[PDB]
Design a protein around this ligand. Structure first.
Ligand code: 70R
Ligand SMILES: OC[C@H]1O[C@H](O[C@H]2[C@H](O)[C@@H](O)[C@@H](O)O[C@@H]2CO)[C@H](O)[C@@H](O)[C@@H]1O
Length: 514
């Protein structure tokens, strides 16, 4: 579907997209190739849906956290710049776009949130979150407020949640160990909800409202990234960019992003995109053009980062970055974020308590790994006749009981529905690893095309088991794990909210309990 002889680029609407379009023009000048820059809404959700069908842009810009998902689904070209080009960027930026040992995007700029304050209202900004309520009472007596920032996107609230011990995935990354509902995270989120309760903040505040309030001098502080600074310059607010406040004596820990540019695997213009990015964008003049539209942060390109490093707003961005953590790029980042977005919104609005919101968030963040664990073990033990000896790990009680439940219910389905299982198995002609990939697409669609309950879920998994037995029979045992990942993937993507609403696999256990 993608058109040859041209470049289509997607980038978020808070970045310097007119600036990018000028770098575009310059590429056209030399090559005769038109460059179109677009900034559609929800482009990070839209890219994977459209790229899957071989559609979408040639180039997508986003922070690096999303790109492992994209690579895992096969949606990105492996980029292989030569050593001379690699040496022009900071190795840590290349690290942020490395997935399964392969480079999967070009890094552009490092982004962290800072505290932005209005110096005419607050000559000295607060060192602690704890002093903010009193500061707010003080500012409200003069018709102003202390702080406003986007409470609709968990990226802005995370530095506080993480300050006293909240984490996504532990310290490689242990995907088994999630810290979304530990006491640290509870305390950070509770402090936020109290802010709202006591009228220091409003749960409906979003990007635009916080931006408008700060940029007209109604609120003394916001929380935002470098991209925001241009609009504040335009507004004549006398602002500073500084270190985020501490919570319970500990630094606020923002999740640091590396703005990154990946090339669509379905693109017929890969040499053009590589040439654009390496030799027009990632140059002193290319990045300047973008930075002057909307500041990029600390750019990946060493030569231009040296000029920008002198700016104290960059120094403050790097100081907040140093106290935070580089985002993981693992495929589960998307589910983590979706879960935490929901938890913050619901806690803030009062729809759930902090305990309920973060419990649900934890379940959602663990859902993939846990489902895979159960599903994978079932298919393998069914195929070989023997259980996996290794420990279940964290949430092991749930996993173990789900597996025992599934053994009872799934064996019953296979036994009672042998005929049809044999029938559809026999129809499909599973002989190789290629034919197994085919199978998924069918299961993918047969599952998705129907209602939602545990019987249909058991049925999907049991058929998986039935196929697994076959695959061992014909010495294709290597294909069982990919079958399990595939089944798990349809299950947790299409059924996420229903699964969370059931208390995940504890609900499966209860529903089929004798
Ligand atoms: C495996 C299969 C699926 C199926 C998939 C498939 C096909 C291929 C492929 F890759 O993937 S993925 C998938 N995911 C969820 N469901 C599926 O099926 C059920 C219906 C069902 C079917 C067979 C057994 C039990 C079935 O339900 C039992 C059920 C549902 C609710 N509660 N309980 C009771 C319980 F709680 F106890 F489970 C559903 O959609 O509701 C499926 C769908 C239909 C099937 O046979 C149709 C009959 N042709 C057989 C072949 N012949 C040549 C033509 C006729 C067959 Cl075999
Ligand atoms: O809100 C969760 C969101 O956080 C990050 O998105 C940031 C992005 O990194 C920044 O470049 C800037 O545009 O603001 C976004 C927040 O609205 C993650 O990168 C993203 O994947 C996640 O959903």
């Amino acid at each position: 579907k993608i058109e040859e002889g041209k470049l289509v680029i997607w980038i978020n609407g808070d970045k310097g997209y007119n600036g990018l379009a000028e770098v575009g023009k310059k590429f056209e000048k030399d090559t005769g190739i038109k460059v179109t820059v677009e900034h559609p809404d929800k482009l990070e959700e839209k890219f994977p849906q459209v790229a899957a069908t071989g559609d979408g842009p040639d180039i997508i810009f986003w922070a690096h956290d999303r790109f492992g998902g994209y690579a895992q689904s096969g949606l990105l070209a492996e980029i292989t710049p030569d050593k001379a080009f690699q040496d022009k960027l900071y190795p840590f930026t290349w690290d942020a776009v490395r997935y399964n040992g392969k480079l999967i995007a070009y890094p552009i700029a490092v982004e962290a949130l800072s505290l932005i304050y209005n110096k005419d209202l607050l000559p000295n900004p607060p060192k602690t979150w704890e002093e903010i309520p009193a500061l707010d009472k003080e500012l409200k007596a003069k018709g102003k407020s202390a702080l406003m920032f986007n409470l609709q996107e968990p990226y802005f609230t995370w530095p506080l949640i993480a300050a006293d011990g909240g984490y996504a995935f532990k310290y490689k990354y242990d995907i088994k160990d999630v810290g979304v509902d530990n006491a640290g995270a509870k305390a950070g989120l509770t402090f936020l909800v109290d802010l709202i309760k006591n009228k220091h903040m409003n749960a409906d505040t979003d990007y635009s409202i916080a931006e408008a309030a700060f940029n007209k001098g109604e609120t003394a502080m916001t929380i935002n990234g470098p991209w925001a600074w241009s609009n504040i310059d335009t507004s004549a607010v006398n602002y500073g960019v500084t270190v985020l406040p501490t919570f319970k004596g500990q630094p606020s820990k923002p999740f640091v992003g590396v703005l990154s540019a990946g090339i669509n695997a379905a693109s017929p213009n890969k040499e053009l995109a590589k040439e654009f990015l390496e030799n027009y964008l990632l140059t002193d003049e290319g990045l300047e053009a973008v930075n002057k539209d909307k500041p990029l942060g600390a750019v990946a390109l060493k030569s231009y980062e040296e000029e920008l490093a002198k700016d104290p707003r960059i120094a403050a961005t790097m100081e907040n970055a140093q106290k935070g953590e580089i985002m993981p790029n693992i495929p589960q980042m998307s589910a983590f974020w979706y879960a935490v977005r929901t938890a913050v919104i619901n806690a803030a609005s009062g729809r759930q308590t902090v305990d309920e919101a973060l419990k649900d968030a934890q379940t959602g963040s663990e859902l993939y790994r846990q489902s895979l664990e159960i599903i994978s073990r079932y298919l393998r033990e069914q195929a070989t006749g023997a259980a996996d000896t290794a420990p279940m790990g964290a949430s092991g009680a749930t996993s173990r009981k789900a597996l025992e439940t599934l053994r009872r219910v799934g064996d019953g389905v296979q036994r009672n529905h042998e005929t049809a299982f044999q029938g559809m198995l026999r129809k499909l002609d599973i002989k190789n690893e290629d034919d197994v990939k085919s199978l998924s697409r069918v299961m993918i669609h047969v599952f998705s095309d129907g209602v939602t309950n545990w019987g249909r879920i058991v049925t999907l998994i049991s058929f998986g088991a039935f196929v697994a037995k076959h695959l061992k029979t014909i010495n294709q045992e290597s294909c069982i794990e990919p079958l399990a990942e595939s089944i798990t993937d349809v299950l947790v993507r299409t059924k996420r909210d229903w699964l969370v609403k059931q208390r995940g696999w504890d609900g499966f256990v209860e529903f089929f309990h004798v």
